[PDB]
Design a protein around this ligand. Structure first.
Ligand SMILES: C/C(=C/COP(=O)(O)OP(=O)(O)O)CO
Lengths: 238, 247, 239, 248
């Protein structure tokens, strides 16, 4: 009885050691994940000094890639969404569509199917030589019927628009115009729901364009694309 | 008797300890005295290390190109028109073959020195410093990456380290030129000895080996003169009336 | 007899269990420390934080303040050190001081007193309206007798201003910096394990320069360098 | 029992002996290295002074006359009337109050030295060497009897040690003058610095006392300049293109 007791105590201590080692492994895994994120952010900030080619690598790490598919039920009458539900082109006349509360009566906006409850996300849209467009995100609780809701970042809309190809200005108060010497052909939008941050970047050379003020979110958002001028150049999502 | 005989050597062990201790003692005192004398020598060197020296250079006929004519005092050279009609000069490893250049005889490794050269009525010439370990057989390029720090006159213009993109904007013709060397700072400077005006200073570079003077003559039948150091009145008699206008 | 061997094995394996738990505890502490440190890093990098709402905060959080005192035993015989050991000045003629083997005989440099082995430190220096200065860090086994180029491959990480308008960093070959303002106070930050040396503007918060990705294998000292005779001195702000 | 303890201590005693031998050989090798460095030191000292030394002359203002005006770099002197009046100049034991003369700061004991002076358009000057134990309070004749070895210009003629029967038959105006000193041979010489030609050599004598430079300025408002030694590029920054046409 003594020998078997010593043996079973030995086995119990062995189990103690092995689960201690398992917890050690999970802890070092968490620590190493934190280290990777820290270094990624470090090089992200250091590159933001002047410029770099690192732009199209770090987003593969920090934020998860996008598969954005448009929702035709949210598509306005004067905009026609391609069959892929990926791109939309402004149409001459509002087609025959029944009234939809999700559809902006005054705004020419299209919302996507999926919902961005949490996490961090991004997406690029090509503009090429676009003459006018507006890009961003908006919430469900906002008003989609009245046309008197002005463009402020505190009504649920985080958006900015390019007009004439020479004012790349945010939709805030006052009319904040931002100077950009090189007219880009592909722009990236970055969303961080946890910290409520919106970043507006140029997907050509990693040039910073715009950072929204630190306003915390309260509701999942939806993509917003606004076209008020009919131009042959269109918008495509990648 | 094992205990007694094995204890008999404690006196020997004590004696060995004793001799070792006294040896340590005289070692201590001797090294202290030597350190004192060394400190005195170091103090004298520290006082004497901040002086400028004026040198006198005598040319070395072992490194001279076979087509150069040196005066008997070895203080002037000329480039002669194929004087080798019946003259043989053997090719030792230290003799230039494709370049008309001459070297000095003294090697410096510390301190500051300077000397003067007269280049009046000459057309193309080169004056500077060079490392003693430079290739001397075959055509070479006089570039600081090979060990040459020179100043030259070429086609009526004054050239730096022989890059053709940094001509110097001098205002008159140069008659007397001074070369100044500071070894611990990597300093080589060229001066004009008429106003004592600074002309040029090359970028600093570590020598790590002794350096020697370097002269090159590019024209035909024209002499260069090295100004001798001031000697005073040695080797001569000074009468009570005094020595006036000595030649 | 097998009972005794089982007892010995039980004792040894219990000690191994104890060591496993100790390793676990160090792992957990390291994790929580890294999490809080990453939060502080994020708020530091968050934007081009320049309205003083972060600079003081992240400087007091992620870097410890160091007291720097100048020792006369290293100064070139041209330089003069105050009684507080805080300021440096240049004299008209060199002094007469012994040639100890820890003095700069050719260059115009003065070193600090203490060394840095590991950690994160910072200090602040007042440059006033001077026209020429150079500041940085240097190794311990650097060459002090003679002329050696001030280069990272020789053990110097420095930067500064010459000619009254030319800002530069001392590399091979030298590079030019383009600032839109006139710095009046400079903050120097050092991180050892990462290998980061940072120069910042301490009045507003703009960023001047950063030496990164360097493996230090010895100890480091603060280093200052001046070359002109002016009525303004180099002050070290106390903390 | 004492035998086992004796054996136990004997091995320790025998083991502690070699401490002496490594101490000894370390002492010997260090001594060899020190002797090598000392001999190198002595050889370089022997390679030292046998040369010519170009000196940097700076004047000291505690020997000057209460009438002379000095520059702020202590390298120029002029004679000005009624400018220092009303300013209390101390009466030092080393002050000149008979003749307007200034002395150098350095004393010499051995070796060869030389320096240069700029006398372009001064009308009456005297330059030379004086013992640092000369009379400073009295009107002492500037002759080699009391310890002055000088050269001067007086009323448009260049003259020697100031005996009026030693007029030097010069052929051109003097713009820069060189002074040479050799302690061992008792040699003091004066040179013309345009073409490095010899002017005069004083009769041989023994100094036995440290000597100093000596300048005296006559009735003239023109200053005299002492040529500084060549410095090169110390205290200045050299770019990668080089330093060209440097003017202070
Ligand atoms: C007298 C001065 C020496 C500067 O030499 P450098 O030519 O190396 O100047 P820098 O390019 O700034 O390193 C410091 O004592």
């Amino acid at each position: 009885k003594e020998k078997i007791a010593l043996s079973r105590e030995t086995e119990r201590e062995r189990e103690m050691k092995e689960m201690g080692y398992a917890a050690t492994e999970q802890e070092i895994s968490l620590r190493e994940k934190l280290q990777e994120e820290l270094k990624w952010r470090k090089i992200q900030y250091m590159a933001r000094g002047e410029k770099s080619l690192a732009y199209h690598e770090w987003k593969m790490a920090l934020f998860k890639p996008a598969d954005v598919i448009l929702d035709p039920d949210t598509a306005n009458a004067i905009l026609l969404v391609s069959e892929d539900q990926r791109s939309v082109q402004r149409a001459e006349e509002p087609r025959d569509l029944p009234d939809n509360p999700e559809r902006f009566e005054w705004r020419y906006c299209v919302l996507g199917c999926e919902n961005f409850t949490s996490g961090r996300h991004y997406w690029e849209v090509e503009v090429g030589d676009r003459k006018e467009w507006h890009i961003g995100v908006c919430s469900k609780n906002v008003e989609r019927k009245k046309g008197w809701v002005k463009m402020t970042p505190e009504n649920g809309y985080w958006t900015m628009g390019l007009t004439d190809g020479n004012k790349y200005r945010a939709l805030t108060e006052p009319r904040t115009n931002l100077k950009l010497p090189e007219p880009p052909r592909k722009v990236g939008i970055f969303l961080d729901y946890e910290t409520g941050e919106i970043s507006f970047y140029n997907a050509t050379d990693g040039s910073h364009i715009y950072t929204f003020p630190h306003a915390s979110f309260s509701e999942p958002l939806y993509p917003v694309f606004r076209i008020l001028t009919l131009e042959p150049t269109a918008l495509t999502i990648c | 008797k094992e205990k007694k005989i094995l204890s008999g050597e404690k006196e020997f062990e004590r004696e060995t300890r004793e001799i070792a201790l006294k040896e340590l003692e005289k070692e201590r005192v001797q090294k202290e005295e030597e350190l004192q004398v060394k400190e005195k020598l170091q103090e004298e060197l520290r006082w004497r290390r901040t002086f400028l020296h004026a040198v006198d250079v005598v040319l070395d006929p072992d490194t001279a190109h076979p087509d150069l004519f040196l005066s008997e005092d070895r203080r002037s050279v000329r480039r002669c028109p194929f004087r080798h009609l019946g003259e043989s000069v053997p090719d030792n490893p230290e003799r230039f073959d494709s370049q008309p250049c001459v070297l000095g005889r003294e090697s410096f490794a510390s301190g500051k020195h300077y000397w003067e050269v007269e280049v009046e009525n000459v057309i193309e010439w080169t004056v500077g410093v060079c490392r003693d370990s430079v290739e001397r057989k075959g055509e070479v390029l006089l570039i600081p990456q090979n060990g040459f720090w020179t100043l030259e006159m070429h086609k009526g213009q004054y050239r730096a380290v022989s890059s053709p993109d940094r001509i110097l904007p001098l205002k008159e013709s140069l008659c007397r030129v001074g070369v100044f060397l500071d070894y611990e700072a990597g300093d080589v400077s060229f001066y004009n000895m008429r106003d004592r005006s600074h002309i040029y200073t090359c970028p600093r570079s570590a020598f790590s080996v002794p350096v020697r003077p370097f002269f090159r003559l590019g024209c035909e039948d024209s002499p260069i003169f090295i100004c001798p150091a001031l000697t005073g009145a040695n080797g001569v008699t000074v009468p009570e009336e005094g020595l006036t206008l000595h030649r | 007899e097998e009972k005794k061997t089982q007892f010995r094995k039980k004792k040894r394996e219990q000690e191994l269990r104890e060591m496993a738990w100790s390793t676990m505890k160090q792992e957990q502490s390291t994790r929580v420390k890294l999490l809080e440190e990453l939060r502080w890093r994020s708020i530091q990098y968050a934007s081009r934080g320049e309205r003083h709402s972060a600079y003081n905060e992240w400087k007091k959080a992620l870097f410890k303040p160091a007291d720097v005192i100048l020792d006369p035993k290293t100064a070139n015989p041209i330089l003069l050190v105050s009684e507080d050991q805080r300021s440096v000045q240049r004299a008209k003629e060199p002094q007469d001081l012994p040639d100890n083997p820890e003095r700069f005989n050719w260059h115009y440099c003065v070193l600090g007193c203490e060394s840095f082995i590991s950690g994160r430190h910072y200090w602040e220096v007042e440059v006033g309206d001077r026209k020429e200065w150079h500041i940085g860090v240097c190794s311990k086994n650097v060459q002090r007798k003679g002329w050696v180029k001030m280069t990272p491959e020789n053990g110097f990480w420095t930067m500064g201003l010459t000619d009254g308008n030319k800002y530069r960093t001392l590399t091979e070959p030298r590079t030019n910096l383009k600032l839109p303002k006139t710095p009046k106070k400079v903050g120097v930050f050092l991180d050892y394990e990462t290998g980061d040396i940072s120069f910042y503007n301490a009045v507003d918060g703009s960023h001047i320069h950063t030496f990164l990705d360097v493996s230090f294998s010895e100890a480091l000292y603060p280093v200052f360098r001046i070359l002109t005779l002016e009525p303004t001195a180099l002050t070290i702000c106390p903390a």
